[PDB]
Coordinates of C-alpha atoms and ligand atoms in Angstrom, one line a residue:
Chain A
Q1 CA 11.1 -1.3 -35.0
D2 CA 10.4 -0.7 -31.2
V3 CA 8.4 -4.1 -31.2
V4 CA 8.7 -6.3 -28.2
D5 CA 7.5 -9.9 -27.7
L6 CA 6.0 -10.9 -24.3
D7 CA 6.3 -14.4 -22.7
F8 CA 3.4 -15.3 -20.3
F9 CA 3.3 -18.0 -17.6
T10 CA -0.3 -19.1 -17.2
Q11 CA -0.1 -22.7 -16.0
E12 CA -1.0 -21.9 -12.3
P13 CA -1.3 -19.0 -9.9
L14 CA 2.2 -18.1 -8.5
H15 CA 0.7 -16.3 -5.6
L16 CA -2.7 -15.3 -4.3
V17 CA -2.9 -11.6 -3.0
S18 CA -5.6 -10.4 -0.6
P19 CA -8.7 -8.9 -2.2
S20 CA -7.5 -6.0 0.0
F21 CA -4.0 -6.1 -1.7
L22 CA -4.2 -2.4 -2.4
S23 CA -4.7 -0.9 1.0
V24 CA -4.1 2.6 2.5
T25 CA -3.2 4.4 5.7
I26 CA -4.3 7.4 7.6
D27 CA -1.4 8.8 9.6
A28 CA -1.6 8.8 13.5
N29 CA -0.5 12.5 13.0
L30 CA -4.0 13.4 11.5
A31 CA -5.6 12.8 14.9
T32 CA -3.5 15.7 16.2
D33 CA -5.3 18.0 13.6
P34 CA -8.1 20.1 15.4
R35 CA -10.2 19.4 12.3
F36 CA -9.9 15.5 12.4
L37 CA -13.8 15.3 12.8
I38 CA -14.5 17.7 9.9
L39 CA -11.9 16.0 7.6
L40 CA -13.0 12.3 8.1
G41 CA -16.7 13.4 8.1
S42 CA -16.3 14.8 4.5
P43 CA -18.8 13.2 2.2
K44 CA -16.4 13.7 -0.8
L45 CA -13.5 12.0 1.1
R46 CA -15.8 9.2 2.0
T47 CA -16.9 8.7 -1.6
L48 CA -13.2 8.3 -2.6
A49 CA -12.4 6.0 0.3
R50 CA -15.5 3.7 -0.7
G51 CA -13.9 3.6 -4.3
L52 CA -11.0 1.6 -2.8
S53 CA -13.0 -0.9 -0.8
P54 CA -12.2 -3.7 0.0
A55 CA -9.1 -2.4 1.7
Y56 CA -7.4 -2.2 5.1
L57 CA -7.0 1.3 6.6
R58 CA -4.0 1.4 8.9
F59 CA -4.2 4.2 11.5
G60 CA -0.6 4.4 12.3
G61 CA 2.5 6.6 12.0
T62 CA 5.5 8.0 13.8
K63 CA 2.9 9.6 16.3
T64 CA 1.6 6.0 17.1
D65 CA 4.2 5.9 19.8
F66 CA 3.4 9.4 21.1
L67 CA -0.4 9.0 21.4
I68 CA -2.2 8.3 24.7
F69 CA -5.9 7.4 25.1
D70 CA -7.7 9.7 27.5
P71 CA -11.2 8.4 28.1
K72 CA -12.1 11.7 30.1
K73 CA -11.2 14.0 27.2
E74 CA -14.1 15.7 25.2
Chain B
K1 CA 11.1 16.6 18.8
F2 CA 8.0 14.2 19.4
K3 CA 5.9 14.9 22.5
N4 CA 3.0 12.9 23.9
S5 CA -0.6 13.9 22.8
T6 CA -3.9 12.5 24.0
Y7 CA -6.9 11.5 21.9
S8 CA -10.6 11.2 23.0
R9 CA -13.4 8.6 22.6
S10 CA -14.7 11.2 20.0
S11 CA -11.4 10.7 17.9
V12 CA -11.8 6.9 18.0
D13 CA -15.5 7.2 17.0
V14 CA -14.5 9.6 14.1
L15 CA -11.8 7.1 12.8
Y16 CA -14.1 4.0 13.2
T17 CA -17.1 5.7 11.5
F18 CA -15.0 6.8 8.5
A19 CA -13.6 3.2 8.1
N20 CA -17.1 1.6 8.6
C21 CA -18.9 4.0 6.3
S22 CA -16.1 3.6 3.7
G23 CA -16.1 -0.3 3.7
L24 CA -12.5 -0.3 5.0
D25 CA -11.1 -2.7 7.7
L26 CA -9.4 -0.5 10.4
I27 CA -6.1 -1.5 11.9
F28 CA -5.2 0.6 15.0
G29 CA -1.5 1.1 16.0
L30 CA -1.2 1.0 19.9
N31 CA 1.7 3.1 21.7
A32 CA 4.7 0.7 22.3
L33 CA 6.7 3.4 24.2
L34 CA 4.5 3.1 27.3
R35 CA 7.1 1.2 29.5
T36 CA 7.3 -0.2 33.1
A37 CA 10.3 0.3 35.4
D38 CA 12.3 -2.6 33.6
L39 CA 11.3 -1.7 30.0
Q40 CA 8.3 -4.1 29.7
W41 CA 5.4 -2.8 27.7
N42 CA 2.8 -1.1 30.1
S43 CA -0.5 -2.3 28.6
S44 CA -2.7 -0.3 31.0
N45 CA -3.6 2.5 28.3
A46 CA -4.3 -0.1 25.6
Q47 CA -6.5 -1.9 28.2
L48 CA -8.6 1.4 28.6
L49 CA -8.9 1.6 24.7
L50 CA -9.8 -2.2 24.2
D51 CA -12.5 -1.8 26.9
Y52 CA -13.9 1.3 25.2
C53 CA -13.8 -0.2 21.6
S54 CA -15.4 -3.6 23.1
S55 CA -18.3 -1.4 24.7
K56 CA -19.1 0.2 21.4
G57 CA -18.9 -3.2 19.5
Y58 CA -16.0 -1.9 17.2
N59 CA -14.5 -4.7 14.9
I60 CA -10.8 -3.5 14.9
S61 CA -7.4 -5.2 14.2
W62 CA -4.3 -4.2 16.1
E63 CA -0.6 -3.3 15.7
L64 CA 1.8 -2.3 18.5
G65 CA 4.6 0.2 17.7
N66 CA 5.7 2.0 14.5
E67 CA 9.3 1.6 13.2
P68 CA 10.6 0.3 16.7
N69 CA 14.1 0.2 14.9
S70 CA 14.1 4.0 15.3
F71 CA 12.9 4.2 19.0
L72 CA 16.5 5.2 20.2
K73 CA 16.5 8.1 17.7
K74 CA 12.9 9.2 18.3
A75 CA 12.6 8.8 22.0
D76 CA 16.2 7.9 23.4
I77 CA 14.7 4.4 24.3
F78 CA 16.0 1.1 22.9
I79 CA 13.7 -1.9 22.8
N80 CA 15.3 -5.1 21.3
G81 CA 13.3 -7.4 19.1
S82 CA 13.2 -10.2 21.8
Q83 CA 11.4 -7.7 24.3
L84 CA 9.1 -6.4 21.5
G85 CA 8.1 -10.0 20.9
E86 CA 7.3 -10.5 24.5
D87 CA 5.2 -7.2 24.4
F88 CA 3.2 -8.6 21.4
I89 CA 2.5 -11.9 23.5
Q90 CA 1.2 -9.5 26.2
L91 CA -1.1 -7.7 23.8
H92 CA -2.3 -11.1 22.2
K93 CA -3.3 -12.2 25.8
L94 CA -5.3 -8.9 26.3
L95 CA -7.1 -9.5 22.9
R96 CA -7.9 -13.1 23.8
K97 CA -9.6 -11.9 27.1
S98 CA -11.6 -9.0 25.1
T99 CA -15.1 -9.2 23.4
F100 CA -13.2 -9.8 20.0
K101 CA -11.0 -12.7 21.2
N102 CA -10.3 -13.4 17.4
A103 CA -9.2 -9.9 16.6
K104 CA -6.0 -9.8 14.4
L105 CA -2.6 -8.7 15.4
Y106 CA 0.0 -7.5 12.9
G107 CA 3.5 -6.3 13.4
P108 CA 6.3 -5.2 14.0
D109 CA 6.1 -2.4 11.4
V110 CA 9.9 -2.3 11.0
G111 CA 11.6 -0.2 8.4
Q112 CA 13.3 -1.7 5.4
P113 CA 15.8 -4.3 6.1
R114 CA 19.3 -2.7 6.9
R115 CA 21.5 -4.9 9.1
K116 CA 20.2 -3.6 12.4
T117 CA 16.5 -3.7 11.3
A118 CA 17.0 -7.3 9.9
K119 CA 18.4 -8.3 13.4
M120 CA 15.4 -6.7 15.2
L121 CA 12.9 -8.4 12.9
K122 CA 14.6 -11.8 13.3
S123 CA 14.7 -11.7 17.1
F124 CA 11.1 -10.3 17.1
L125 CA 9.8 -13.2 15.0
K126 CA 11.7 -15.7 17.1
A127 CA 10.1 -14.3 20.3
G128 CA 6.7 -13.0 19.2
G129 CA 6.1 -14.5 15.8
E130 CA 3.5 -17.1 16.9
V131 CA 0.9 -14.5 17.9
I132 CA 1.1 -12.2 14.8
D133 CA -1.3 -12.9 11.8
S134 CA 1.1 -11.1 9.3
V135 CA 4.6 -9.7 9.4
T136 CA 4.5 -5.8 8.5
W137 CA 7.5 -3.9 7.3
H138 CA 7.8 -0.5 5.5
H139 CA 9.5 0.7 2.4
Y140 CA 10.3 4.0 0.7
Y141 CA 12.5 4.4 -2.4
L142 CA 13.8 7.9 -1.6
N143 CA 14.2 10.7 0.9
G144 CA 11.5 13.3 -0.1
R145 CA 14.0 16.2 0.8
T146 CA 16.5 15.1 -1.9
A147 CA 14.5 13.0 -4.4
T148 CA 14.7 14.2 -8.1
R149 CA 12.5 13.9 -11.1
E150 CA 15.1 11.6 -12.7
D151 CA 15.1 9.3 -9.6
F152 CA 11.3 8.8 -10.1
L153 CA 11.9 7.6 -13.7
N154 CA 15.1 5.5 -13.1
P155 CA 14.7 1.7 -13.3
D156 CA 17.9 1.3 -11.1
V157 CA 15.9 3.0 -8.3
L158 CA 12.8 0.8 -8.9
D159 CA 15.0 -2.3 -8.9
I160 CA 16.3 -1.7 -5.3
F161 CA 12.8 -2.8 -4.0
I162 CA 13.5 -6.3 -5.2
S163 CA 16.5 -6.7 -2.9
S164 CA 14.5 -5.2 0.1
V165 CA 11.7 -7.9 -0.6
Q166 CA 14.3 -10.8 -0.8
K167 CA 15.9 -9.7 2.4
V168 CA 12.6 -9.6 4.4
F169 CA 11.6 -13.1 3.1
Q170 CA 15.1 -14.4 4.1
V171 CA 14.4 -13.2 7.7
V172 CA 10.9 -14.6 7.7
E173 CA 11.8 -18.0 6.0
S174 CA 14.5 -18.4 8.8
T175 CA 12.0 -17.8 11.7
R176 CA 8.3 -18.3 10.8
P177 CA 8.1 -20.0 7.3
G178 CA 4.8 -19.3 5.5
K179 CA 3.8 -16.3 7.7
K180 CA 2.0 -13.7 5.5
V181 CA 4.2 -10.7 4.7
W182 CA 2.6 -7.2 4.4
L183 CA 3.9 -3.8 3.5
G184 CA 2.5 -1.9 6.4
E185 CA 3.4 1.6 5.2
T186 CA 5.0 2.4 1.9
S187 CA 5.5 5.3 -0.6
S188 CA 7.8 6.9 -3.2
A189 CA 9.7 9.0 -0.6
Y190 CA 9.7 9.4 3.2
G191 CA 9.5 12.7 5.2
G192 CA 6.1 13.4 3.6
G193 CA 7.0 12.8 0.0
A194 CA 9.1 14.7 -2.7
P195 CA 7.5 18.1 -3.4
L196 CA 5.9 18.5 -7.0
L197 CA 6.8 14.8 -7.6
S198 CA 5.0 12.4 -5.1
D199 CA 1.6 14.0 -6.0
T200 CA 2.0 13.8 -9.8
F201 CA 1.6 11.4 -12.7
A202 CA 5.4 10.7 -12.3
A203 CA 4.7 9.1 -8.9
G204 CA 2.8 6.3 -10.7
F205 CA 5.8 4.6 -12.2
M206 CA 7.0 3.8 -8.7
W207 CA 3.5 2.9 -7.3
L208 CA 2.5 0.6 -10.2
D209 CA 5.9 -1.1 -10.2
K210 CA 5.8 -1.7 -6.3
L211 CA 2.3 -3.2 -6.7
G212 CA 3.5 -5.4 -9.6
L213 CA 6.7 -6.6 -7.8
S214 CA 4.9 -6.9 -4.4
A215 CA 2.2 -9.3 -6.1
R216 CA 4.9 -11.2 -8.0
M217 CA 7.2 -11.7 -5.1
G218 CA 4.7 -12.9 -2.5
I219 CA 3.6 -9.8 -0.5
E220 CA -0.1 -10.3 0.3
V221 CA -1.1 -6.7 1.2
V222 CA 0.5 -3.3 0.4
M223 CA -0.6 -0.2 2.6
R224 CA -0.1 3.1 0.8
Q225 CA 1.1 6.0 2.8
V226 CA -1.2 7.9 2.8
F227 CA -4.9 8.1 1.7
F228 CA -5.2 11.7 3.0
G229 CA -3.0 13.9 5.2
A230 CA 0.1 16.0 5.6
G231 CA 2.5 14.8 2.7
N232 CA 2.3 15.1 -0.9
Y233 CA 2.4 11.3 -1.3
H234 CA -1.4 11.5 -0.3
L235 CA -3.8 9.9 -2.9
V236 CA -6.3 12.7 -2.1
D237 CA -5.3 16.4 -1.7
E238 CA -6.3 19.0 1.0
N239 CA -9.4 19.9 -1.2
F240 CA -10.5 16.2 -1.2
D241 CA -9.7 16.0 -4.9
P242 CA -8.1 12.8 -6.3
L243 CA -4.5 12.8 -7.5
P244 CA -3.2 10.6 -10.4
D245 CA -2.1 7.8 -8.0
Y246 CA -5.7 7.6 -6.7
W247 CA -7.0 7.0 -10.3
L248 CA -4.2 4.5 -10.9
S249 CA -5.2 2.7 -7.6
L250 CA -8.8 2.7 -8.6
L251 CA -8.1 1.3 -12.1
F252 CA -5.8 -1.3 -10.5
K253 CA -8.6 -2.4 -8.1
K254 CA -11.2 -2.6 -11.0
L255 CA -9.0 -4.7 -13.4
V256 CA -6.4 -6.8 -11.5
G257 CA -7.3 -10.1 -9.8
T258 CA -6.0 -11.9 -6.8
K259 CA -4.2 -14.8 -8.8
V260 CA -0.8 -13.5 -9.8
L261 CA 0.9 -14.8 -12.9
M262 CA 4.1 -13.8 -14.7
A263 CA 5.0 -11.7 -17.8
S264 CA 8.5 -10.9 -19.1
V265 CA 10.0 -9.3 -22.2
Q266 CA 12.0 -11.5 -24.7
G267 CA 15.7 -10.2 -24.9
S268 CA 18.4 -9.2 -22.4
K269 CA 17.1 -5.5 -21.8
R270 CA 14.3 -5.8 -19.2
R271 CA 14.9 -2.6 -17.2
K272 CA 12.8 0.1 -18.9
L273 CA 9.7 -2.0 -20.1
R274 CA 8.2 -3.5 -17.0
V275 CA 5.4 -6.1 -17.3
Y276 CA 3.0 -7.8 -14.8
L277 CA 0.2 -10.4 -15.4
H278 CA -2.7 -11.5 -13.2
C279 CA -6.1 -13.1 -13.7
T280 CA -8.7 -10.4 -14.4
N281 CA -10.7 -9.2 -11.3
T282 CA -13.9 -11.6 -11.4
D283 CA -16.0 -8.7 -9.8
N284 CA -15.6 -6.6 -12.9
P285 CA -18.9 -7.0 -14.7
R286 CA -17.4 -6.7 -18.3
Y287 CA -15.1 -9.7 -18.1
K288 CA -15.3 -13.4 -17.5
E289 CA -13.6 -16.3 -15.8
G290 CA -10.4 -17.0 -17.6
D291 CA -9.6 -13.5 -18.8
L292 CA -6.1 -12.0 -18.2
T293 CA -4.9 -8.5 -17.0
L294 CA -1.6 -7.4 -18.2
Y295 CA -0.1 -4.1 -16.9
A296 CA 3.0 -2.4 -18.2
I297 CA 5.3 0.5 -17.6
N298 CA 7.3 2.2 -20.3
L299 CA 10.3 4.1 -19.0
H300 CA 11.8 4.4 -22.5
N301 CA 11.6 7.7 -24.3
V302 CA 9.9 6.1 -27.4
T303 CA 6.7 4.2 -27.8
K304 CA 7.0 0.4 -27.6
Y305 CA 4.7 -2.0 -29.3
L306 CA 3.9 -5.2 -27.3
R307 CA 3.1 -8.5 -29.1
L308 CA 1.1 -11.1 -27.0
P309 CA 2.2 -14.8 -27.2
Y310 CA 0.2 -17.8 -28.6
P311 CA -2.6 -18.6 -27.9
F312 CA -3.6 -14.9 -27.0
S313 CA -2.2 -13.1 -30.2
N314 CA -5.7 -12.7 -31.9
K315 CA -7.9 -12.1 -28.7
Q316 CA -9.9 -8.9 -28.2
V317 CA -8.0 -6.7 -25.9
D318 CA -9.3 -3.7 -23.9
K319 CA -6.6 -0.9 -23.4
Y320 CA -6.7 1.3 -20.2
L321 CA -3.8 3.8 -21.0
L322 CA -3.0 6.5 -18.4
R323 CA -1.3 9.7 -19.6
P324 CA -1.0 13.1 -18.0
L325 CA -3.2 16.1 -18.8
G326 CA -1.0 19.0 -19.9
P327 CA 0.8 21.4 -19.8
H328 CA 2.9 20.0 -17.0
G329 CA 3.7 16.5 -18.5
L330 CA 4.8 13.9 -15.9
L331 CA 4.6 16.7 -13.3
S332 CA 0.8 17.0 -13.9
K333 CA -1.7 16.5 -11.1
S334 CA -4.3 15.4 -13.7
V335 CA -4.5 12.3 -15.7
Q336 CA -6.4 11.0 -18.7
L337 CA -7.6 7.4 -19.4
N338 CA -7.5 6.7 -23.1
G339 CA -7.6 10.5 -23.7
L340 CA -10.5 11.4 -21.3
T341 CA -9.6 13.4 -18.2
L342 CA -10.6 11.5 -15.0
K343 CA -12.7 13.7 -12.6
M344 CA -15.5 13.0 -10.2
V345 CA -19.0 13.3 -11.7
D346 CA -19.9 15.0 -8.4
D347 CA -19.0 14.6 -4.6
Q348 CA -21.0 11.4 -4.5
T349 CA -20.2 9.8 -7.9
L350 CA -17.0 8.3 -9.4
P351 CA -16.8 8.2 -13.2
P352 CA -17.0 5.2 -15.4
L353 CA -13.5 4.0 -16.3
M354 CA -13.9 3.5 -20.0
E355 CA -12.0 0.8 -21.9
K356 CA -10.6 1.3 -25.5
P357 CA -11.1 -1.9 -27.5
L358 CA -8.1 -2.6 -29.8
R359 CA -8.3 -4.2 -33.3
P360 CA -7.9 -8.0 -32.7
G361 CA -4.3 -9.0 -33.7
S362 CA -2.9 -5.5 -33.3
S363 CA 0.3 -5.0 -31.2
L364 CA -0.3 -3.1 -27.8
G365 CA 1.0 0.5 -28.1
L366 CA 2.6 1.9 -24.9
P367 CA 3.8 5.5 -25.3
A368 CA 6.9 6.8 -23.8
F369 CA 6.9 7.5 -20.1
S370 CA 3.3 6.0 -19.6
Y371 CA 1.6 3.0 -18.0
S372 CA -1.4 0.9 -19.1
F373 CA -3.6 -2.0 -18.3
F374 CA -4.7 -4.4 -21.0
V375 CA -7.5 -6.9 -20.5
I376 CA -7.3 -10.1 -22.7
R377 CA -10.9 -11.2 -23.3
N378 CA -11.9 -14.8 -23.7
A379 CA -8.3 -15.7 -22.7
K380 CA -9.8 -19.0 -21.3
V381 CA -6.9 -19.4 -18.8
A382 CA -7.8 -22.5 -16.7
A383 CA -5.6 -21.3 -13.8
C384 CA -7.9 -18.2 -13.6
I385 CA -10.8 -20.8 -13.0
Ligands
LIG401 C1 6.3 6.2 8.1 C2 5.7 6.8 9.4 O1 4.9 5.9 10.2 C3 4.9 8.0 9.0 O2 4.2 8.6 10.2 C4 5.7 9.1 8.3 O3 5.0 10.3 7.9 C5 4.6 11.2 8.9 O4 5.7 11.6 9.6 C6 6.8 12.2 8.9 C7 8.0 12.4 10.0 O5 8.2 11.2 10.8 C8 6.2 13.5 8.2 O6 7.3 14.1 7.3 C9 5.0 13.2 7.3 O7 4.5 14.5 6.9 C10 4.0 12.4 8.1 N1 3.0 12.1 7.2 C11 1.7 12.3 7.4 C12 0.8 11.7 6.4 O8 1.3 12.9 8.4 C13 6.3 8.5 7.0 C14 7.2 9.5 6.3 O9 8.4 9.7 6.7 O10 6.7 10.2 5.4 C15 7.1 7.3 7.4 O11 8.3 7.5 8.3
LIG402 C1 16.4 8.5 -25.6 O1 16.9 7.5 -24.8 C2 18.2 6.9 -25.3 C3 18.5 5.6 -24.6 O2 17.5 4.7 -25.0 C4 17.7 4.0 -26.2 O3 17.5 4.7 -27.3 C5 16.1 5.1 -27.6 C6 16.0 5.8 -29.0 C7 15.2 4.0 -27.6 O4 15.4 3.0 -28.7 C8 15.3 3.1 -26.3 O5 14.3 2.0 -26.4 C9 16.7 2.7 -26.1 O6 16.9 1.8 -25.0 C10 19.2 8.1 -25.2 O7 20.5 7.6 -25.7 C11 18.8 9.4 -25.7 O8 19.7 10.4 -25.3 C12 17.4 9.7 -25.3 N1 16.9 10.9 -25.9 C13 16.5 11.9 -25.1 C14 15.9 13.2 -25.8 O9 16.5 11.9 -23.9
NAG403 C1 5.2 10.0 27.2 O1 4.6 9.4 28.4 C2 5.2 8.5 29.2 C3 4.4 7.8 30.3 O2 3.0 8.2 30.3 C4 6.4 9.2 29.9 O3 7.2 8.4 30.7 C5 7.3 9.8 28.7 O4 8.4 10.6 29.3 C6 6.6 10.7 27.7 N1 7.4 11.0 26.5 C7 7.6 12.2 26.0 C8 8.6 12.3 24.9 O5 7.1 13.2 26.3
NAG404 C1 1.4 1.7 34.0 O1 1.0 3.0 33.7 C2 -0.1 3.4 34.6 C3 -0.7 4.7 34.1 O2 0.3 5.5 33.5 C4 0.4 3.5 36.0 O3 -0.4 4.1 36.9 C5 0.8 2.0 36.4 O4 1.1 1.9 37.9 C6 2.0 1.5 35.4 N1 2.4 0.1 35.7 C7 3.7 -0.1 36.0 C8 3.8 -1.6 36.4 O5 4.6 0.6 35.9
NAG405 C1 16.6 -7.4 25.4 O1 16.2 -6.4 26.4 C2 16.0 -6.8 27.7 C3 15.9 -5.4 28.5 O2 14.6 -5.1 28.2 C4 17.3 -7.6 28.3 O3 17.0 -8.1 29.6 C5 17.6 -8.7 27.3 O4 18.8 -9.4 27.7 C6 17.8 -8.2 25.9 N1 18.0 -9.3 25.0 C7 19.1 -9.5 24.3 C8 19.1 -10.5 23.3 O5 20.1 -8.7 24.6
CL406 CL1 17.2 -6.1 18.2

């Protein structure tokens, strides 16, 4: 009758994940968008980001290996 | 195809401010294709960045390279795992001499473990494994160009992830036993996602199953590609509006604890009804020490009714059932929690995620092509402290 019985193992934790287990990325590509400052300055986007704290934010992507830091650029 | 670009102090500040103001821990990927005469990593550009970040008192973690397995394709440069390991040792020495000498270092951000990628990861961990804090690798189920709706609902596609995970742990157990293993970049489909699929309710089967299996199999951290950006696997669209996977991600974070347990369905057929069990998140103000969080995926085309085992059969259960808002069904970009559409209250305010208490002793209803969380109140599981 579409009824299903579950078995649970509850003796001990099998693993411990990070409190940051569910983390996110921002692609390296986004830093090549002329609007990078406007986008990451968005209050609405920051509210949604705070919702996922605690988390890691990985800044990385294919473009990681094609980006050069220029300390003289404005 | 890929050309060098520069970024500014301004760009670094934008990124850091966004992480800091959002309560996120920034990990910054350094360019590994900056190479000396004899293909050693040239750390001179990274030095300029570490110095700048040090001067601004930025608390940042580091990576070096992205998918070094595909450098030959992307840049007609081959770096072997042994050399990359040496490059990571060189970065570890720079970090140790910087203001944040205890900064963390992750890598090598390899793709999923095909023969050549497994070889690179093994030689990398032999050479450089001592200086990384976690091993990072990447996974996608599908090519976004060719992915179908049926693929997003196919338990045979979901199950392929289990073999990828087993293959990565075989390499790590052979080289750096007990080193933490992270998914450093992961999604439904690569090449920016599957149009009309990666940004829908249908994407949630893959995402929730990946989280469940990652936690069950020993992965400590899963990094979702992408929070926001060019690719319809984003959690947040171009209008800064949350997609169904954002809401699923937020519910997961509210209900699921750090201590991983195990659930399974009695009977041979275990493909289409997928079940996961953790301690309940202790930070959730509704629940108490000992409570359980079950989450389940139903890929059957009929409702299933789940029965909890002794001694949990008569406990008060809170249901958190996600279903799409019509008319586009699983291809909807809107989701309801227990029949209420999830939407921002305003640009500053997330909505409450309201439980549906079930009749104590009732079976847990899971509609066709849906996913749900169930919190078992007063479970009093000692393992959950
Ligand atoms: C993992 C890569 O690190 C990541 O950068 C890829 O996504 C970006 O690059 C691809 C092409 O390499 C583009 O199709 C995506 O639109 C990019 N995404 C964003 C968010 O800018 C990613 C992927 O293939 O989707 C992985 O290769
Ligand atoms: C529904 O799915 C069928 C295969 O699934 C099995 O049968 C259904 C009724 C449920 O009992 C499920 O739990 C079983 O595993 C298909 O044979 C059938 O074609 C499907 N119907 C449609 C409309 O796609
Ligand atoms: C990127 O820069 C390096 C050194 O700064 C250079 O040798 C290389 O050719 C550049 N690559 C591309 C693809 O433009
Ligand atoms: C590393 O790169 C810098 C700047 O591109 C260059 O001037 C320096 O001499 C390079 N070092 C080696 C050893 O090639
Ligand atoms: C790895 O690469 C370097 C060249 O950068 C080479 O000297 C070394 O022999 C290579 N290692 C193996 C195992 O081939
Ligand atoms: Cl190699």
